[PDB]
Design a protein around this nucleic acid. Sequence first.
DNA 1: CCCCCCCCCCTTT
DNA 2: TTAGGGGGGGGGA
DNA 3: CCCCCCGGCCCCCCCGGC
DNA 4: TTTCGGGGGGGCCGGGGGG
Lengths: 493, 257, 330, 318
Amino acid sequence: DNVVREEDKLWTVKYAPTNLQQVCGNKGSVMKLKNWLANWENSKKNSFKHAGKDGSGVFRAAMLYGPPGIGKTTAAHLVAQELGYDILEQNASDVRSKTLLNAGVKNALDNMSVVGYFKHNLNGKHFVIIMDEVDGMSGGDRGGVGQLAQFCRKTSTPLILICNERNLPKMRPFDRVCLDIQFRRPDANSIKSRLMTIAIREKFKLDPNVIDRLIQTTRGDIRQVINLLSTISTTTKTINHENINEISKAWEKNIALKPFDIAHKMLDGQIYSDIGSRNFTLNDKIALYFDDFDFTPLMIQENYLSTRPSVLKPGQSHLEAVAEAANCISLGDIVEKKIRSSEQLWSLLPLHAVLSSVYPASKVAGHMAGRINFTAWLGQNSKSAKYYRLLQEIHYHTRLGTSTDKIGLRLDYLPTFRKRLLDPFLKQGADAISSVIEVMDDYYLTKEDWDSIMEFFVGPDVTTAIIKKIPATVKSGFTRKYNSMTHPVAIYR
Amino acid sequence: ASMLEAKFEEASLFKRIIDGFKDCVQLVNFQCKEDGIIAQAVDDSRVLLVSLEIGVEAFQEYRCDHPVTLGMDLTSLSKILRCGNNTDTLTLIADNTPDSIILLFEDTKKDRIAEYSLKLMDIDADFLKIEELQYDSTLSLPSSEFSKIVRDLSQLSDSINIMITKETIKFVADGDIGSGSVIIKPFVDMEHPETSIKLEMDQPVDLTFGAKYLLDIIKGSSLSDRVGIRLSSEAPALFQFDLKSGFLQFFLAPKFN
Amino acid sequence: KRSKENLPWVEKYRPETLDEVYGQNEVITTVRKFVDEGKLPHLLFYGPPGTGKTSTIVALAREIYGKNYSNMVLELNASDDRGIDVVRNQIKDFASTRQIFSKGFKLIILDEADAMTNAAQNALRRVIERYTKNTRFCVLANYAHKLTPALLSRCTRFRFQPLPQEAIERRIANVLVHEKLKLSPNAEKALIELSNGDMRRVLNVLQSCKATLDNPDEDEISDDVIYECCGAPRPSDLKAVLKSILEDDWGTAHYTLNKVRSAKGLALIDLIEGIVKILEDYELQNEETRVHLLTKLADIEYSISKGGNDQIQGSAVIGAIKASFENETV
Amino acid sequence: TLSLQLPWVEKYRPQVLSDIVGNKETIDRLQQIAKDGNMPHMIISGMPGIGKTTSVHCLAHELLGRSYADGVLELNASDDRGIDVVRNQIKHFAQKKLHLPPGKHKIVILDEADSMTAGAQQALRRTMELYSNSTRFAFACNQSNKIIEPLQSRCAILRYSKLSDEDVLKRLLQIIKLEDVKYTNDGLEAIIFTAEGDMRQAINNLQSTVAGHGLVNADNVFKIVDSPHPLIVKKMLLASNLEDSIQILRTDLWKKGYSSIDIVTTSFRVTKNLAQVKESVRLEMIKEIGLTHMRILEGVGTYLQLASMLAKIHKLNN
DNA sequence: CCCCCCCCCCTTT
DNA sequence: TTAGGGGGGGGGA
DNA sequence: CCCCCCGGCCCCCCCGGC
DNA sequence: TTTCGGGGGGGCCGGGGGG
Ligand SMILES: Nc1ncnc2c1ncn2[C@@H]1O[C@H](COP(=O)(O)OP(=O)(O)OP(O)(O)=S)[C@@H](O)[C@H]1O
Ligand SMILES: Nc1ncnc2c1ncn2[C@@H]1O[C@H](COP(=O)(O)OP(=O)(O)OP(O)(O)=S)[C@@H](O)[C@H]1O
Ligand SMILES: Nc1ncnc2c1ncn2[C@@H]1O[C@H](COP(=O)(O)OP(=O)(O)OP(O)(O)=S)[C@@H](O)[C@H]1O
Ligand SMILES: [Mg+2]
Ligand SMILES: [Mg+2]
Ligand SMILES: [Mg+2]
């Protein structure tokens, strides 16, 4: 047998934490996870219905999430080993599709460990299923993400899931099934001792005053910090202020910004000045747009009226600059329609970047007056789609009787239908029920069509308060009468 | 090419042995000593343990200078072995500090020699000690019948329950589409002892196991006509197939009560 | 496919040897020198339509390999599947294997490579690099912006210019000799003018002119025949329209434009292009005049490209020209 | 002729770390690593033709030596590199047993790694982590942003800068001495100017000029290498008189056969990078150029549209 | 001990 | 120059 | 006559500029 | 959100071959 010399190993392996206390930072999260896994057995004894002081007794699965290289996997393995559980580990290198998930780990959710039996702690025979890199699985249904979410609800043994981005759409199925544990970027103070110990052991000089800079270079990535030290020390045995700037610039972690950060940066007036534009060039602004080309234009259109500008030309009011920005945004919308047409003119993406984001921002750049808001266009679009679907259903129910298109139905017929369907209840009480039903029968309208019709009106003709004000007895009688009769069908499927 | 030299007079035996458990464990460490070959492998789910013993009598000219350990992936080994022939003699050659092992297929009737090299794997799996245990139930039954029952019951549920009582063996599988049951009792025939189902029940037993694990286990039925199942109250079930001078054993952890 | 005389002239007169390619003397000389001394590099022929790129590469393949070049080269174009899978399997296999027939090197011709996907172009990089000892690549394109920088880094670039007057004249003379045709000097000048450096247009128009003659064995192709077959305005018509626009009142200009167009049913776009060509030579005292002319006429051309009302577009042309030229006084 | 002369980019491809020019500090770091081994996971990024593949291959060769054939696994964009490949072939290579000197490891060279799919990159994470005691990974790419952050965390970042004219001249002089090429200073200056920091391009142009004309002077170099059209476009956009810009457009671009789409795209790029003009003026110019680009994509690609674009740019600039 | 400093991180289909 | 607001954690009158 | 291997459709998810 | 087109990855289906 041949062993590996410690001199042959990577510094990250050579100095990997061995117990939970050596983990730098995120002490609260580590304690929370340890207590959860320690009292998991008691939580099971109570059928996972009684919540303790921490409220973790109602979760059969824990979900650890945070940025890269902060100690998620290390902490998970350390807690699993400390409590004496047998670890069953899965990662992105393994196939975790729905079929493999059901044919693989599914059978281990309520199964004993042969290893835990032949190595004999009372939990030694029980598993701790660690699913690492959950964000590294692709697919909506065949991927098995929803399958893992389902597993998290009925697992008979502890289950720990690890990911990097908890807010991705693919993570939606894990909304409120697991105890969420957040690992944050550790600050320089929580690690300074570790790097100084590594420096003295590795026989190279490191100035403490630059540690804060080094972390800033790695964005709190301890693994990247160790890699940087290992690579730099190969030729430069002393790290001080005389060489910190070059090392930081060469090793800077360039991560794509998120929509809120993109909006904040693009709307800052400083970058649009002569010196600012010379430091942050137009190419940099286009790249910033390209960090997320789908969401950046929506962010800009959402937040371009919520600034105090500092780039106003002489004699120009804020309103005039807003108008110019709005015109440019309209042109950008036209370009976007061109891009997503049958010609697939994706080569126009850079132009879009200028018209939708850079130009209006340069017109209204300044300081954000209030909080930055997420785009409201997506929700409004979904609501409009829902209302149009309901309108189409109503129209094709009433098609046999009316003479109009759906738009004409909304604009013209609906007020009169309101008068002949809703007003009678507010005047004659229950005595009008029959009449209303009669009208419905004349137009093949159902109860759901009635509610949907009542949901369309805007302005002074809003019906929610009026409907809620109706006596409950009248509505109950209306439902009873409608359910006590036979009704026609406009469309026979 | 002299440290380890193990000759099977028939290449079919080793290929069948590998196929017996190639669908459950991928990486396997074979420990070769003067007494023969022993292997122990844990499945990915860590609930099924495969143990293999091959005695010297099974070989023809077994020779081992000093104990050696060979880590092999079973897919590559099966691919290599499928290039041989049953009549051909198969010789395994290994040297000191080997990075690979040589598989030599020789034909006596002809003068055709097929030499293959297989790169060894660096496996750092721990070796577990299995101590002899006295089980409360021991049943020997035909391998074909056991495989048939297992396959029939796996069509209904993901788990199968085995219940052993006085001269009675019951296999149940209850799922969503439906349920199925199979009942057998001990029987012996002098004319056909090979079909004699034998049961020794010190105490009644009741256990449940995963269907996929049993399906993997029954793949060894091609090696032995009979199969021996040992069950304890709360211990892993042992499924054993006997060889000429060795054995293939599957220790399956049951599902928690 | 009963005879070569049944082919369109654009294909009947396809050059078969490098000596039959005109107007690209520098490129032909350089590539011939490369082949003669066995120093052929990876090539990139870039140029506009109908300049001789495909013809040149096919002739080069024939020169290198001879009559059986077809089985000795791997030609792929936009009508074939050229996804990343094709690069990974077919191109890679061809580049790494010896020739079946001879022992010479191997040639891969990626015609119209600007239509290839980015993934396939990226996959081509190491195929080109690894097998350069025995394989060479030729890439043909009209649009260089569709080619990845990595691919361009590995290729030697040759630009095919728009065909000069002399080359078109010589090829026209050869075609006239072959077809037993007569061509007037004015008709020849008009044909060159409308060619715009594309030989395909010359050949197609000449074939149409021959079809137009009542007795092609005795009738000569005059400029009238060319203008009739192509339905294009005469220079005199353009001069008259421009003079009326710049000199007469609106009624006279409108009447003259309508009359000129109705005489032979000319298209407004052809008149616009001819007048633009004429005006480029005009010396203007004010830059604002040129700015207005260019912007307004470009807008009118773009509007015409989508259809619209022809009469309103003609009036717009007249008004734009008059308004622009009113800037030459003050 | 059925014979081929080996290209000089391959004949004089550096075989040792000391023959690579440019990025001196990183090259010395690689030399030290090769000396003492303990190679870590690394990502080498930079622009085309600056010696990334050369650097990786030289490092691997100098580290392994006779064991190179067995201890190196090379995969590039021309090979299959799907998630299945990562999960089977790369994993088998990482698990494989190989006796190496006390300070050496197996190497996986993933050239052009920016083209790898996100699934394969995700699958590589724990493979890198678990088998680091025997295997190390070297990525080479042009755009490091395409490499997912988890992989960047596990690797050492080496960003290659562009080659200066001095290093290019030094390498060209070495190759010229080895080939006894006859040249003139103006010829080498033209080669370097047209190369734009691309060593591969410079060597290819030098070899082509020598083959086609023998003497490497200005005239032959410009006959073989055309003046980059981005500079012509910049001259067109920076002209003060509309007539001058139109003349440049007609004579240097349109009559030379450059397509309208190429002209408009190059104009967009040059305008974006025109640091000498105020950003707002550049934004207006880009708006006009985008209008013209949309018109051209619609099918109206004509000299008149480009002339109108130039007229609008001049009107903006006045 | 509550309060403060200081930072990070979430708003988000 | 720090968008508002909430969470975490070291310091301390 | 029945079971297993492995080529081929088929479906579904994800970029698309430099 | 999403109007083609390319690429990848996973799931069945079925031909052929073997036993
Ligand atoms: N809190 C920490 N303290 C000390 N070292 C750390 C710490 N976090 C990370 N490291 C170092 O970086 C190496 C990797 O740590 P990991 O536990 O893998 O972080 P991670 O958050 O799981 O990264 P990902 O999600 O796989 S990209 C460790 O072996 C340590 O050497
Ligand atoms: N230099 C030329 N000399 C003689 N004929 C030419 C020449 N160029 C084009 N032609 C004629 O036009 C036809 C087409 O020539 P091609 O070589 O196919 O042009 P091309 O540059 O390849 O066109 P593209 O780029 O595919 S649109 C030839 O068959 C010839 O008849
Ligand atoms: N620093 C260099 N020193 C000497 N020659 C170089 C250098 N860089 C490039 N070359 C030469 O150009 C050839 C190609 O170099 P490469 O290493 O392939 O460039 P590259 O950066 O890997 O190209 P990409 O990124 O795949 S497009 C080498 O064989 C050398 O002949
Ligand atoms: Mg991790
Ligand atoms: Mg062509
Ligand atoms: Mg390269």
